[PDB]
Ligand binder design. Structure first.
Ligand SMILES: *[C@@H]1O[C@H](CO)[C@@H](O[C@@H]2O[C@H](CO)[C@@H](O[C@@H]3O[C@H](CO[C@H]4O[C@H](CO[C@H]5O[C@H](CO)[C@@H](O)[C@H](O)[C@@H]5O[C@H]5O[C@H](CO)[C@@H](O)[C@H](O)[C@@H]5O)[C@@H](O)[C@H](O[C@H]5O[C@H](CO)[C@@H](O)[C@H](O)[C@@H]5O[C@H]5O[C@H](CO)[C@@H](O)[C@H](O)[C@@H]5O)[C@@H]4O)[C@@H](O)[C@H](O[C@H]4O[C@H](CO)[C@@H](O)[C@H](O)[C@@H]4O)[C@@H]3O)[C@H](O)[C@H]2NC(C)=O)[C@H](O)[C@H]1NC(C)=O
Ligand SMILES: *[C@@H]1O[C@H](CO)[C@@H](O[C@@H]2O[C@H](CO)[C@@H](O[C@@H]3O[C@H](CO[C@H]4O[C@H](CO[C@H]5O[C@H](CO)[C@@H](O)[C@H](O)[C@@H]5O[C@H]5O[C@H](CO)[C@@H](O)[C@H](O)[C@@H]5O)[C@@H](O)[C@H](O[C@H]5O[C@H](CO)[C@@H](O)[C@H](O)[C@@H]5O[C@H]5O[C@H](CO)[C@@H](O)[C@H](O)[C@@H]5O)[C@@H]4O)[C@@H](O)[C@H](O[C@H]4O[C@H](CO)[C@@H](O)[C@H](O)[C@@H]4O)[C@@H]3O)[C@H](O)[C@H]2NC(C)=O)[C@H](O)[C@H]1NC(C)=O
Ligand SMILES: *[C@@H]1O[C@H](CO[C@@H]2O[C@@H](C)[C@@H](O)[C@@H](O)[C@@H]2O)[C@@H](O[C@@H]2O[C@H](CO)[C@@H](O[C@@H]3O[C@H](CO[C@H]4O[C@H](CO)[C@@H](O)[C@H](O)[C@@H]4O)[C@@H](O)[C@H](O[C@H]4O[C@H](CO)[C@@H](O)[C@H](O)[C@@H]4O)[C@@H]3O)[C@H](O)[C@H]2NC(C)=O)[C@H](O[C@@H]2O[C@@H](C)[C@@H](O)[C@@H](O)[C@@H]2O)[C@H]1NC(C)=O
Ligand SMILES: *[C@@H]1O[C@H](CO[C@@H]2O[C@@H](C)[C@@H](O)[C@@H](O)[C@@H]2O)[C@@H](O[C@@H]2O[C@H](CO)[C@@H](O[C@@H]3O[C@H](CO)[C@@H](O)[C@H](O[C@H]4O[C@H](CO)[C@@H](O)[C@H](O)[C@@H]4O)[C@@H]3O)[C@H](O)[C@H]2NC(C)=O)[C@H](O[C@@H]2O[C@@H](C)[C@@H](O)[C@@H](O)[C@@H]2O)[C@H]1NC(C)=O
Ligand SMILES: *[C@@H]1O[C@H](CO[C@@H]2O[C@@H](C)[C@@H](O)[C@@H](O)[C@@H]2O)[C@@H](O[C@@H]2O[C@H](CO)[C@@H](O)[C@H](O)[C@H]2NC(C)=O)[C@H](O[C@@H]2O[C@@H](C)[C@@H](O)[C@@H](O)[C@@H]2O)[C@H]1NC(C)=O
Ligand SMILES: *[C@@H]1O[C@H](CO)[C@@H](O[C@@H]2O[C@H](CO)[C@@H](O[C@@H]3O[C@H](CO)[C@@H](O)[C@H](O)[C@@H]3O)[C@H](O)[C@H]2NC(C)=O)[C@H](O)[C@H]1NC(C)=O
Ligand SMILES: *[C@@H]1O[C@H](CO)[C@@H](O[C@@H]2O[C@H](CO)[C@@H](O[C@@H]3O[C@H](CO)[C@@H](O)[C@H](O)[C@@H]3O)[C@H](O)[C@H]2NC(C)=O)[C@H](O)[C@H]1NC(C)=O
Ligand SMILES: *[C@@H]1O[C@H](CO)[C@@H](O[C@@H]2O[C@H](CO)[C@@H](O)[C@H](O)[C@H]2NC(C)=O)[C@H](O)[C@H]1NC(C)=O
Ligand SMILES: *[C@@H]1O[C@H](CO)[C@@H](O)[C@H](O[C@@H]2O[C@@H](C)[C@@H](O)[C@@H](O)[C@@H]2O)[C@H]1NC(C)=O
Ligand SMILES: *[C@@H]1O[C@H](CO)[C@@H](O)[C@H](O[C@@H]2O[C@@H](C)[C@@H](O)[C@@H](O)[C@@H]2O)[C@H]1NC(C)=O
Ligand SMILES: *[C@@H]1O[C@H](CO)[C@@H](O)[C@H](O)[C@H]1NC(C)=O
Ligand SMILES: *[C@@H]1O[C@H](CO)[C@@H](O)[C@H](O)[C@H]1NC(C)=O
Ligand SMILES: [Cl-]
Ligand SMILES: [Cl-]
Ligand SMILES: [Cl-]
Ligand SMILES: [Cl-]
Ligand SMILES: [Cl-]
Ligand code: NA
Ligand code: NA
Ligand SMILES: [Zn+2]
Ligand SMILES: [Zn+2]
Lengths: 561, 554
């Protein structure tokens, strides 16, 4: 009884628009009057660094949330920002048209339409359409494209051959571009229409996870970006000056930059390769050592500190996180304990997220502490990232992951979680299919159910398969969102998102306690197993699914200004 | 030996030692403060140069200094979007002249003619780079407000009246900045005035080889640089898309070859391209082409490392395919045939190009007549719009000579562009510093050459073998032959070696005459020589260019 938003298919932008018969340039580009196809966009047809926008009322509620999520990716990785339209002469009007499409560049026409239609509410689709708005074309149309890919003309659907035309017009050809067609673009049959000449990229082309490194380089070079709104720092200890961090102790303890520890880890997490290590084996009980960042300058007032930790020491050792915030009244700073990380499981790298709310210049202080008893190792930290973003609400850590890919036993249910509004939920990850991974959001019976609004109204669940790249700026995480529509009905006439005790099926927790699970809402095409096995989604055989469930009923109201 | 001339006079004097010794009393040793300019203040947009800086090299400059300054401009052209042009009447320009010491104002002071001094002993490329970073608006690194978290100031060790030289986006403190004091700055005695908190960097501060990566990031961010004038491409095959190079594939991306090499050069983890000539017929070829490149200058230097585990009969052909509006598919020209490649070691090659339109480099491996058990491998390809070195001195098994009595090395003989025969002397025997000297030697053209040797500038570069040309901090010094220079006995220093030189033997035992050596006893410290990639696979490369600079007398 699960609901698949993708209807048992894996349709890209180009499959959605083809199925509607839109006949746009290269499937999703709306050419302007006398605009030259695949031509250089001049300075006059560019947006300012901050783009005014309107999210029109025709947009689906899930689409509005997804678009705002896309803006947060631009704010982390570029110096492009977006602001609600306040009367500027030109702005982007995002609306529910037929299919997903955009003009290429700032056409200087005042209100400029960008369509995010039905089935276009995917963050990378939004990112792709806004790259068109910013002035970018597709990658496979480059004049040198035949040196990198082969077009299988006999496999293209009759009358769709013109979508592969090249014109007359530097960064290397980018197979990973979010602006590249997939190998199945306009195919007639089961055989690919685009074959990469380098066999390694056959299943890479057509990625729809995030911007590629080359997509970002081109955009950041165009807008002269030297910073972003929400990136703060990334440290993997790869250089001897360790990103300006300063280690100290009053206890004959220290943090050492090492490539290995005899008791563990045998190597860094980044994966020659270095990490910081607090030895607890040869210091006295209660000895501490602090590793302090250089001074950082926040622009937003909320932050997410994240890092990987390895414990080869004792159950009694701990890592304390402090913030030292500086203000005019106290130049030595105000030191505050923000997190105590205790009883760290031994023998594996583990990801931690710490929520911060610092508004003044500050330093992050990592304090390793030796606890009671004996130790043969210590605490190791690597891949520290800091951004002015919200921490995920919940994190589902799946260990020994690879054994489940394409396997009949690959039907995984997350631990139960409580959303911000108090709804209890569970995630279902289906890895049993031969080619695609599926992901579904379920409401479950919870302690607050008697006082909650039913059917569940406009909660947006964002599920992110983390790309565990050492640098937050280089992660191409695979993210999908769904929104609970309180008017959605089942085949039997009941409300899909009603109270699980009323419409749910019986299930058991790992401990054997019975509960009610509502219908699952999600997609059978979350990611292909081939892409799931690429980049750093799996690292040390661990997978992380980040989860945020929030009320988006405030997005219903007309955008006024 | 005794006939050599050390330009550094048995010392290793930095900018701050030169100016201190003259009693200039400038801000932080080499900054000329403007009227009511606030010390170490943020340089506003109004006090910045345009992307192209107009300049004049004044006649007071020493001939060697003029050549060194133009060499410094080439470093800016490769690593930044800053360029330099001869002044043609722009409102503000930099007047480079021989003043007392090395110094500059900080920023474009908008005063019209703005002086920058490159005085006696300042004719070092990194000194020029440092003074032009001041002109561009940069101060020194150790004056940063957080500097006490990274270094200790030994106040008791500073010369009286010099304490003022130490009292003070989001890039970490840079120990390797070309703008950082060395540990001996303004010292009174033999003890350091600046001591890094971390013992590692104690002798790293004060590097004067080239820009650091953080120096370049700050400058490139300030001028929104997305390209440079002379960088074209760098490929170490670290990614599967192999930097857009095009080619079953005849060149294979591998991490090892059974008959050699056991690993990549850049240093599975590392990768290189390999043509397995052993598995194909005689006459078979393998073609690897760069992506399309867009030149801005009319001259280029293509460089790469090659490893041959195949036969002496295998070869590598280099073609250029140049594209123009009229040509349907480009114009292919053979530019280089690399034959009889010595086997069993990575070797650096340089190829001179003169392309003016968009083009591709075409690498063609060819299987020769002899039986082969391996193939040809290529790694660390770099292309820039620069002049190739005239000669390269490749020193194998280098490490054994550092600090050793036997570390007195003489290069093979070379012929300069004007026909002068020369040899390089590298002295590694000192406990802390490496020395380098240029000698003229007897050669076949000596009867037809002008004597004493007039205004030939010899540029000697210790190559930092980083895989990426943009990240090399190569250590370079130049000297110029002054035909009026005399010896203690009254003879001309640069006269004909048969007349003023000493008897020497080549490796083969043939006798020749060697003139006096001219160079420095402080070319590089052994500590810095052992850092970065100066030594790689126990190989060292000294790049050599010897050219006539009498045209700079103007
Ligand atoms: C087999 O396995 C099963 C599955 O694992 C087991 O089942 C679980 O069993 C446990 C134990 O029996 C059970 O735990 C209980 O959970 C209760 C619900 O927890 C969530 O909700 C509350 C309340 O949320 C409402 O209020 C907040 C504001 O306070 C608001 O933000 C929410 O939106 C929400 O509002 C809505 O509802 C109210 C009515 O409730 C309406 O008035 C309102 O209008 C809205 O509609 C949250 O507070 C909880 O969050 C806290 O706790 C979690 C977990 O510890 C923390 O992660 C989280 O940060 C938060 O922390 C708070 O407390 C700490 C101090 O401890 C503070 O520092 C911090 O600032 C926060 O205030 C959850 O999201 C919960 O109420 C209940 O609590 C009772 O015990 C505690 C002691 O622990 C007392 O202090 C309380 O007074 C209560 O007496 C208790 O924890 C699980 O719910 C249950 N799970 C499921 C899925 O069924 C099973 O037991 C096992 N079987 C066996 C045999 O082993
Ligand atoms: C122990 O070890 C000792 C040390 O190694 C050995 O000593 C060496 O022994 C060899 C063999 O006996 C000896 O070789 C000879 O070298 C002669 C000099 O070579 C250099 O100079 C010439 C001439 O330069 C002048 O002319 C050019 C233009 O024509 C001009 O650009 C120059 O600036 C210069 O001008 C000035 O002088 C002239 C007068 O000469 C004035 O008229 C003028 O006004 C100026 O004042 C250069 O041509 C040479 O360069 C060519 O060769 C080198 C090496 O091969 C190349 O790297 C270089 O690119 C260039 O290549 C040329 O040929 C290729 C062919 O494919 C062309 O493509 C290219 O375009 C060039 O034309 C040197 O820089 C040299 O003249 C002489 O040549 C004769 O033999 C060859 C045989 O192949 C014939 O072809 C010629 O016609 C000649 O008959 C010969 O090569 C070394 O000089 C000697 N070294 C030293 C330091 O002493 C010792 O032998 C050994 N003992 C034992 C027992 O083993
Ligand atoms: C040194 O730093 C301390 C820690 O600062 C916090 O942490 C660091 C890491 C950064 O993230 C900072 O930005 C952050 O403030 C300062 O103490 C903190 O002060 C703030 C007020 O400035 C205070 O916040 C209030 O909290 C109450 C609720 O308090 C309970 O709950 C918190 C946890 O949430 C708990 O920590 C407390 O112990 C309490 O049990 C809340 O009602 C307040 O809301 C109201 O305030 C805003 C205006 O500020 C208003 O717009 C709202 O509408 C609303 O009415 C407010 O959020 C923190 O609780 C407190 N934290 C701690 C651990 O003490 C510290 O400040 C000094 O102490 C404060 C108690 C207060 O007397 C200040 O005036 C003092 O300066 C600071 N010390 C100095 C000398 O600068
Ligand atoms: C196809 O390419 C051929 C090879 O080009 C060269 O090599 C490639 C790798 C690349 O570096 C190119 O940039 C090189 O040009 C072309 O042949 C060459 O053409 C050039 C002229 O474009 C010839 O040159 C001259 O060489 C003389 C000595 O031999 C010099 O005296 C002369 O100097 C004068 O040059 C300029 C004006 O151009 C003045 O400003 C100077 O002050 C000076 O007086 C030139 O440098 C070169 O010799 C040719 N090489 C060969 C091997 O033929 C070829 O070009 C065609 O043929 C030449 C002969 C001319 O008729 C061209 O007009 C003609 O296009 C290319 N073919 C096509 C069709 O494009
Ligand atoms: C060049 O000199 C190197 C250093 O010589 C040693 O130190 C001097 C200060 C002096 O006391 C001298 O007597 C010493 O021998 C030689 O390398 C050293 O060789 C010794 C003995 O073979 C060896 O134990 C050391 O590890 C080694 N040191 C270093 C820093 O490499 C060079 O010798 C060559 O290398 C040897 C390993 C050996 O194969 C020998 O036959 C080689 O000649 C000297 N090189 C040359 C070309 O003479
Ligand atoms: C999608 O692909 C299928 C399979 O290739 C296409 O169908 C095939 O189209 C060809 C067109 O030349 C047909 O061949 C011709 O058939 C006639 C008889 O019908 C014969 O007289 C000719 O000599 C020639 O063989 C082929 O029969 C047909 N096959 C099938 C199974 O239908 C289809 O047209 C493609 N669709 C699109 C939208 O591109
Ligand atoms: C990114 O930064 C670069 C500068 O580092 C900006 O480039 C500059 O763009 C302006 C036009 O916007 C060019 O202006 C020129 O002005 C003169 C008059 O002073 C006029 O004659 C020329 O026709 C031209 O308009 C300027 O040359 C150019 N500078 C360089 C070095 O390229 C670029 O605009 C910035 N990008 C964004 C999105 O802001
Ligand atoms: C580098 O590019 C930025 C724009 O991307 C330029 O910054 C602008 O500078 C003007 C004044 O010259 C201001 O009015 C704008 O507000 C700036 N825009 C932003 C977004 O900062 C900067 O001037 C360029 N630098 C150089 C040297 O040309
Ligand atoms: C899920 O299915 C796969 C494929 O059949 C199995 O490999 C997994 O088995 C687990 O791993 C093997 C190596 C062995 O240790 C076995 O005992 C494990 O169960 C299987 N996983 C689970 C959890 O059943
Ligand atoms: C560098 O050291 C190695 C030993 O580790 C020597 O074998 C090299 O000698 C050279 O190569 C051998 C095979 C033989 O041809 C010999 O005559 C050579 O000298 C040595 N290389 C150099 C240049 O000294
Ligand atoms: C993962 O695999 C190891 C064996 O390699 C096993 O000991 C461990 O319990 C497994 N973890 C989980 C969470 O299943
Ligand atoms: C240098 O140090 C000596 C010894 O302390 C001291 O007597 C002398 O005055 C100092 N000179 C200067 C110039 O500071
Ligand atoms: Cl999303
Ligand atoms: Cl790092
Ligand atoms: Cl130089
Ligand atoms: Cl100016
Ligand atoms: Cl180089
Ligand atoms: Na690391
Ligand atoms: Na390599
Ligand atoms: Zn598109
Ligand atoms: Zn200076």
């Amino acid at each position: 009884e699960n609901f698949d938003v993708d209807g048992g298919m894996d349709q890209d932008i180009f499959d959605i628009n083809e199925g509607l018969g839109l006949d746009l340039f290269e499937g999703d580009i709306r050419l302007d009057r006398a605009q030259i196809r695949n031509s250089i966009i001049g300075e006059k047809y560019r947006w300012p660094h901050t783009i005014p926008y309107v999210l029109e009322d025709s947009l689906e509620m899930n689409a509005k949330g997804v678009i705002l999520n896309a803006f947060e990716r631009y704010r982390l990785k570029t110096c492009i920002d977006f602001k609600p339209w306040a009367g500027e002469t030109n702005y982007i009007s995002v609306f529910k048209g037929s299919g997903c499409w955009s003009s290429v560049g700032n056409r200087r026409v005042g209100k400029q339409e960008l369509s995010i239609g039905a089935n276009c509410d995917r963050i990378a689709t939004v990112q792709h359409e806004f790259l068109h708005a910013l002035g970018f074309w597709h990658e496979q149309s480059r004049s040198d494209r035949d040196d990198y890919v082969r077009i299988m003309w006999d496999r293209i659907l009759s009358g769709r051959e013109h979508n592969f035309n090249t014109y007359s017009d530097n960064v290397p050809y980018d197979y990973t571009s979010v602006m590249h067609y997939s190998k199945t673009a306009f195919q007639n049959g089961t055989e690919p229409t685009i074959v990469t000449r380098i066999s390694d990229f056959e299943d890479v082309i057509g990625q729809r996870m995030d911007f590629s490194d080359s997509d970002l380089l081109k955009l950041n070079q165009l807008y002269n970006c030297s910073s972003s709104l929400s990136f703060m720092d990334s440290c993997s200890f790869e250089l001897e000056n360790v990103c300006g961090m300063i280690q100290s102790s009053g206890d004959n303890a220290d943090w050492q930059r090492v490539s290995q520890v005899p008791r563990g880890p045998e190597s860094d997490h980044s994966n020659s390769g270095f990490f910081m290590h607090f030895d607890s084996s040869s210091v006295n009980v209660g000895a501490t050592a602090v590793l302090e960042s250089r001074t950082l300058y926040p622009k937003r007032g909320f932050q997410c500190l994240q890092f990987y930790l390895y414990n080869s020491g004792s159950e009694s050792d701990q890592l304390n996180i402090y913030i030292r915030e500086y203000s005019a009244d106290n130049v030595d700073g105000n030191l505050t304990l923000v997190e105590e990380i205790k009883e760290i499981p031994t023998g594996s790298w583990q990801l931690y997220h710490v929520t911060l709310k610092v508004t003044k210049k500050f330093r992050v202080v990592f304090e390793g502490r030796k606890g009671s008893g004996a130790s043969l190792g210590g605490l190791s930290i690597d891949d520290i990232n800091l951004s002015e973003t919200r921490c995920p609400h919940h994190i589902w850590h799946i260990r020994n992951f690879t054994q489940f890919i394409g396997s009949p036993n690959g039907t995984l249910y997350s631990p139960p979680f409580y959303s911000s509004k108090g709804y209890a939920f569970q995630i279902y990850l289906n890895l049993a299919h031969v080619t695609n991974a599926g992901i579904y959001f379920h409401l479950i019976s919870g302690a607050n159910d008697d006082q909650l609004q039913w059917p569940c109204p406009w909660q947006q669940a964002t599920m992110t398969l983390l790309d565990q790249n050492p640098d937050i700026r280089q992660r191409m995480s695979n993210q999908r969102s769904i929104t609970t529509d309180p008017f959605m009905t089942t085949d039997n006439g009941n409300y899909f998102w009603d109270r699980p005790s009323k419409v749910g099926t019986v299930a058991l927790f790992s401990n054997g306690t019975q509960f009610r699970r509502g219908g699952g809402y999600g997609t059978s095409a979350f990611i292909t197993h081939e892409r799931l096995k690429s980049r750093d989604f799996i690292k040390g055989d661990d997978v992380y699914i980040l989860l945020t469930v929030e009320d988006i009923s405030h997005l219903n109201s007309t955008q006024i200004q």
